[PDB]
Amino acid sequence: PPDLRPLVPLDGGRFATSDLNDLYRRVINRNNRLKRLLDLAAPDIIVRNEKRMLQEAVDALLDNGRRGRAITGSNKRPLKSLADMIKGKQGRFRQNLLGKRVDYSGRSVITVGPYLRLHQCGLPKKMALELFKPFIYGKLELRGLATTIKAAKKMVEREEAVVWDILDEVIREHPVLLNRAPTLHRLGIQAFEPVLIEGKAIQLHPLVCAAYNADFDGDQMAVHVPLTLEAQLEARALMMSTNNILSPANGEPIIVPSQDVVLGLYYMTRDCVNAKGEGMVLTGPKEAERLYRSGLASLHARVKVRITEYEKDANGELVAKTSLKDTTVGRAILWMIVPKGLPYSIVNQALGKKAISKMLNTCYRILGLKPTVIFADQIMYTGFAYAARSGASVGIDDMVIPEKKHEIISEAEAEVAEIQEQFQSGLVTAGERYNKVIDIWAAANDRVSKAMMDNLQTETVINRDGQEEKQVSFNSIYMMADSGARGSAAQIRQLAGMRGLMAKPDGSIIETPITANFREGLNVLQYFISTHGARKGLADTALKTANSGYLTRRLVDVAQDLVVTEDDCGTHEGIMMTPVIEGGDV
Amino acid sequence: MVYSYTEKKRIRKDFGKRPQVLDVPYLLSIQLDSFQKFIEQDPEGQYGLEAAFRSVFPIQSYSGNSELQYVSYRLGEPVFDVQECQIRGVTYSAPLRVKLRLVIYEREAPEGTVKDIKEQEVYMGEIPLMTDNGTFVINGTERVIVSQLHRSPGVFFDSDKGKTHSSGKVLYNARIIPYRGSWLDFEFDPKDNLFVRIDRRRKLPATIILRALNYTTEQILDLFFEKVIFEIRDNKLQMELVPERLRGETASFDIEANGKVYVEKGRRITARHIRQLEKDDVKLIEVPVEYIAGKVVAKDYIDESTGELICAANMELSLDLLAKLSQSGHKRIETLFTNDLDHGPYISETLRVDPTNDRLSALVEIYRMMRPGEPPTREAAESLFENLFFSEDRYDLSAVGRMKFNRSLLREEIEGSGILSKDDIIDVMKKLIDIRNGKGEVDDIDHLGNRRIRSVGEMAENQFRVGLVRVERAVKERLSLGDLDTLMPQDMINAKPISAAVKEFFGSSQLSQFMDQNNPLSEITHKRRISALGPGGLTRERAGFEVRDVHPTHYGRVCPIETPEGPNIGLINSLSVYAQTNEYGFLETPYRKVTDGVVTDEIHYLSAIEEGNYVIAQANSNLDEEGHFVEDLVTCRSKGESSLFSRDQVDYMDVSTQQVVSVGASLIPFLEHDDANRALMGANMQRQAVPTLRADKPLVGTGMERAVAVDSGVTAVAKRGGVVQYVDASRIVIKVNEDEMYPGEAGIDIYNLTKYTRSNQNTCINQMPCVSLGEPVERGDVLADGPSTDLGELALGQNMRVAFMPWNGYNFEDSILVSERVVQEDRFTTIHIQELACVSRDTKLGPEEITADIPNVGEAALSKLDESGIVYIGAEVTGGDILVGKVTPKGEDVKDSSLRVPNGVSGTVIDVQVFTRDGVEKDKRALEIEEMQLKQAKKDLSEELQILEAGLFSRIRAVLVAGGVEAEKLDKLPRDRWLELGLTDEEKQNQLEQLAEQYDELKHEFEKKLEAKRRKITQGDDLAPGVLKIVKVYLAVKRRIQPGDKMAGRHGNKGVISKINPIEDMPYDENGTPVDIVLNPLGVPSRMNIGQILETHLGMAAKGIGDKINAMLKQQQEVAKLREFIQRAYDLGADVRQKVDLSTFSDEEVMRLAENLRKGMPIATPVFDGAKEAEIKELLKLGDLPTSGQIRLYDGRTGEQFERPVTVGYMYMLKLNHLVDDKMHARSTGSYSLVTQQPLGGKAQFGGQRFGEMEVWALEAYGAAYTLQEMLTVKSDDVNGRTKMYKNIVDGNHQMEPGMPESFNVLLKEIRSLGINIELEDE
Amino acid sequence: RERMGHIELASPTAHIWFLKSLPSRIGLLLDMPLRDIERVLYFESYVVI
DNA sequence: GGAAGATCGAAAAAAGCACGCTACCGCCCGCGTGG
DNA sequence: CCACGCGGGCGGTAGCGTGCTTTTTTCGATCTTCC
RNA sequence: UGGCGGUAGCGU
Ligand SMILES: [Mg+2]
């Protein structure tokens, strides 16, 4: 049909060329020429050539380039026939049919907003005004402010205050769906209850970011707006982030406190020995908060407080037990936001990342999802506030290099020299020499790492109303390492120990390791050696993305049909289940 | 050492201890040198246009006794200047006028003298010239051609890795690749049989080509195999024994001879036995008849009595065959030695498989293989074989190709013929057989010695040669058919194809790309970028892991750090700082020759191949004052391996510490304390940084910002030293010194700045003068800085007093909280310039006219319009406004097609440019622009006129006072009256007339120049066909910092703005100064960017020093104390290479330096020769700030005190070109596509977001189903559904009508358009 | 958009999806080699009926 | 006893190659006949 | 001497030629088991 | 208020 191969009116008298129109014109010209030749009774050779080139034209029209050369045009490249753009990645079957652009949609860069509840998101005023335009028009028509749609349009472009009030009424409980461009797993798209904010960026909840796998480094979110009641109820029931608490792959919780939040909790649970206010006896967490805010005590002080723990007994009733426990004031403050179901033992720890996750899991299992969401919001607020109050910072002086390390390196060199001497004497071969060199350097690296860890973990020495005593160090880098907010033992080892044995691109280990810390200078050769592994990993991920996408698409296509249709088969046949043992471990 | 006047204003405190022996060369040397070689006359040819002309010409007219040959070529002066070409919008090109000579030889006589010689200069097209800046100007746009990296022509002897055969046996293949022609591969098969493949067609037996080379089977056998002689004389079957031939073979008989039992039957040969054989060195050894059984006979022995051959060549011997030889009487039997491992009998088996037995048969087989489906012809086969390999024009190995061919085969002769010879193939296959036999090693393709860089000149020469042969065909045929009499050689040569090819290469090639003018570093990196893409290169997707790795030979040539992340990683790199190109094209690096133990200052440029032989020292290796290595055992590189070496066994040393990194990566301070990924992407974002309206010097730098700024063309570098005469925001006038005027010259240099000109990325390009009136200048000094430059120093971003601490979760992860004071000072506000175009194309129904009155338009909108019809300069139009009033003729009034402001775009109109075709009536604004340009040109001409006229009138005044001596009457009288003054009849009048005539001649010449400039301005610009008038309007807008904007530091930290917090909430120190930006420390420990902290500390120290200086400036302290403090600050450090002496500077110079240092002293830290922590601590101690680098901050929100000290200091931060206002887009009811009735895409088209396939998958993953139908039909492409949805939402009812998507109907109709019968069943 | 026309070919022509998409449906039905079918079809070789 | 079924190995052809977003360049056209 | 038209390919006695990988088909060449 | 291809670049 003509509309399916339109002649787009280009600027001026020019008309945009269509490949299908050119192919059809070629075919029609060929058919007319063949008809004329047949009518005039041309010699058999001429009509034979005409028929052959008509067949070639039919080849070009039906499927260009299938047999031989594809018929090109002014672009010196093959044209598009029916078959080429029916199939393919850009073909009509999978480009405008399986996934298509939609209206009532937008996109914008995102920023973190701490003052947002778990079920809320921040939408710009302009985005909300543009996306919800028909709803605003309808509400204005109902209100009688605008007599017709044109008047409502004029009022909207004029931006009165009544249009802002109408918009505020519209958005009240209208969820909007937010998603990322590389939506990999099921949790890639979730709905939120938007709230009007200033600025030009979409404020996103911090906890759900790990669900989206989207760091606030310039990533862009895409927002869609449901209209019909069924879509709104889908938004409130299944699109909601609150309902999405357990991952569908392994059942572990998807939301998990991370980064500054957990760090703050760490600073709220570490205990000193001679902190101001030690030995005080308080009656409740309220007095602990009073003392802390008044400046009469420090968060790391160890005191005794009267805790009224509420526990669940038979028939689910709550029983209160009051006991004079020994803890820190920070734990007493943390106890304020804990609901009335959890025991006090879930808080009287160092409050690492895994401890926080376990506490959240216990709260969800015991009290349910509804208290759990509020508890998560409260712990996020408290962690952010007390991380701000902590003032944790990283400095060059916080990076302590173990004193023995240099000496260790020296002895390692001595060792390798001896081994090298053997290869000079012919006692050992080159391969054994290299193996012994690698083993000696690995042992030296392990010793250096152990010495650095021993230096860092318990460096702080404190007077406690008398003689000196040891306690877990307050070094900031050690805080991030132990709390698990960000970083690992390997990274701290690279940071203040030694880089280690780097590898050649082929995979062979370099004979000599990088013996200089990141804190101190790195020579040219060591940096050049590390660049091999850096480029290796970067190229690995770059080529990995495409294969992962292709495998995901194939797996999705394979299992598209399988849905649950019945309750119970009644079959008595099932697979065997035994613990997997590969030998030496389960 | 004496400092330049531009350097005395601000001297950067530079750390580091290693002295520099080689200064940083010209960063744009490669492009300029390549183009200079390409466009210059070469007496020996082999380079540029001369080589192509000599290779192509002359042309024989099919034995027509008439040819034309090259004589000379010349490049004409460009018609338009670079600035004129940029403003007008045309291609900066130069004519190529080639003087040629056609000669018609005498007919009927092959050697007869030429009858007629027609010699003339033909205009053979125009070629684009390249500016001093290193960029080409194509169609009024600045484009850059990157240098490709491709495998060098020659022989590559490699092998498969062994997984192809799946049996653990590797296969060796030798590929001969030419610069032009067909590739030739010799490959081994699993059956140990050689095979030959031409142009990746079906393989053939290797001996087929040998037969085609007119080589007999005996010739091949003796060429590729050794010979053994068997003698049945004396009835003992004695054979000529070679002790080395008996190595590693089990004894099948008793080899005792001369009464000595070296080794007997049943005993495997031993090395002592071979030694005993060598000592005895017996010539011949008796042999049983069974031993010579499997040996193949090389000579096709024939019996003279019978006349028939006993056995053919390369035939396995047999007992009956041996008896036949014995009865024939032949005693000298020939055998081919076939060792199991030392000499593999692959050639014999390959010959056995070969079906062809003669030259004709082999040629027929080759013709069939190359040209399937065609009957074989002997002459056709001969022609095909000769053209495929032995033809000069078809197959041509380049000079670098021949050099590699000879080097790989150890031919020792660098020079050779371009064509491939028989001996070359013989040697190649012999070396392949040697590789198979176990001696020699295969080469590595990833080795940088096997890959060469092709610059712009070589590709331009190749394209020129292609066009030359294209026109050569035409001139050949025209000369062959046409009569040669009265033939004017102009019309044989047609410039259209060659010009089209050149234009296509320079404007649409795979490597010619628009340059990115974000900041001078961006242009420098783009001009020094090496890519592996383009013709004759790798593909973006089918690259492979091995090609994206960094080889150990990349040291000193390719930066391992700078590389675009993504699909192009590894395939695109940046040239090293000191790296240059050899004559053959292979990358080379400087090195210092080490003689004895002392490292001399001699510099040698070592290539990739030769670097692997000598031992290279380390740049960071300690050296004493004398030159010896203080450490006996030093780290070194040898054979591409890093290991410890002694003092004596080192031969070369690195020239400098920064020899490894590129120019872009070398600008990162404290690079040695940063992770490779972090540093790589930090440099990547450093490449993209929009210029701010106030450029601020970086407090912490690496010292090459001066070199980068000078080498880049953004600055205005003076060409001749002198004294500034007239400084202004637009023009600079330089009065050059007495030494530097050419005779008969004004000595006045006029530098015209570029003010608010659009870049290729819609960014501002502004130039601001830095010198003052009366300030002396010297050649090479900067006069006016460009974008992101301050006092001739690169300044990408701004110095912010930042701190590292969490703040209420706003810096949750990598997100940046920015104080409102930054917005107050507008430190990051950026000017963006957009350009809109309107074309008055001529239609068949009628032309288009730009007028003011438009049918049915609001008169209020016409207020911005003028009488001419273009918006006034300086208007504040917004979205939806009209710029130029254009109407177009209608069918059988005028339709309003006037250009309007795109929605969501605003700003101020800065200027309008008009282009008018010749003959079209000029417009009013065109007249205004032309008269403004004429006024500027006349002002420059008058600036020259004033000095010339002053000199001439001073000379005539001297003449008058010498003759008349009425000085008072002279000075009261006007100079024009001096001209007409008469004197007594001698030289007083003669010289007066001779000077008046010169004055008149000067006036006439300058009037002629003014007329020429007026003609140049007035001349109408050429336009596209059918186009009458083109109007371009430039708008500009200031974009300020808003939440969501992307700001990143140099070291690699990224993120977006989270909140513009009012200044009262910022943490404040004891002094009460706000702490400005606050970052998140959490990103530091994981992503290794520790160089941040140190830099931050250093930055703080720098500011502290400046603070002190500022104090001494505020209290009006005397110059002595300021000089002492500056000297103490500069002298700080241990064994620093810089020795600043403040005593030699004058008091004014010291005061100026102190004034420029009042905002902190810039610090230069080399890449690897950086400043240790001790120097930072000492500098902090000098500034009285705490040495720990952490202070006690007080919260401004609550007024409390933070428990732990936090890290604060001044850090350099940039602004990425990733603004938020141009990224947000939202649509409710927009336009729709014609074919699918679906919402469009793209912010510029007001389209809608794309619902991807994974989005549908996730929607099905949840239980939502009505939402999927919303996404699919109602909201996208169901027109009835769309209308009903809109009406229902307006009415308030949220009810749905499913409908039928139009895309499915489109697919149904198109499938029915074929022979398929897809349809609908009634049920 | 849902209205089509027909081109009346002067001579019969083969459909290419049923000819080049392996296995060749025309060749499989006729039980002849694909190369022979292609040579006969493109007006260069003759076939006996 | 030496041809037809089975096998093997090389050649040839088809098919794909994650997702968004941004910017610009060509959407005619040049040579050959009939009024 | 301009407007329609036509077929549109650069390059060259034609053939679409170049450092990916997997699957399917075909065809020639050979090995073998019986009419 | 007309979008169809191609090229290059950017973020995962
Ligand atoms: Mg990110």
Numbering used by the authors:
A (entry chain J): 246 to 831
B (entry chain I): 1 to 892, 912 to 1342
C (entry chain J): 99 to 147
Provide passages from the article that reported this PDB entry.
RfaH, a paralog of the universally conserved NusG, binds to RNA polymerases (RNAP) and ribosomes to activate expression of virulence genes. In free, autoinhibited RfaH, an α-helical KOW domain sequesters the RNAP-binding site. RfaH recruitment requires a 12-nucleotide (nt) operon polarity suppressor (ops) sequence, which induces RNAP pausing.
Here, we assembled an opsPEC on a fully complementary (c) scaffold harboring the ops site, an extended upstream duplex (up to 14 bps), and an RNA that could form a hybrid of up to 11 bps and elucidated its structure by cryogenic electron microscopy (cryoEM) in combination with single-particle analysis (SPA). We show that the formation of an ops hairpin (opsHP) in the non-template (NT) DNA strand stabilizes a swiveled, pre-translocated paused state with an extended bubble and a 10-base pair (bp) RNA:DNA hybrid. RNAP is paused at U11, and no unpaired T-DNA nucleotide is present in the i + 1 position to receive an incoming rNTP. In opsPEC, but not in EC38, the TL β’R933 forms salt bridges with βE546 and βD549, an interaction that may stabilize the unfolded TL. Bases G2-C9 form a hairpin that rests on top of the β‘ rudder R314.
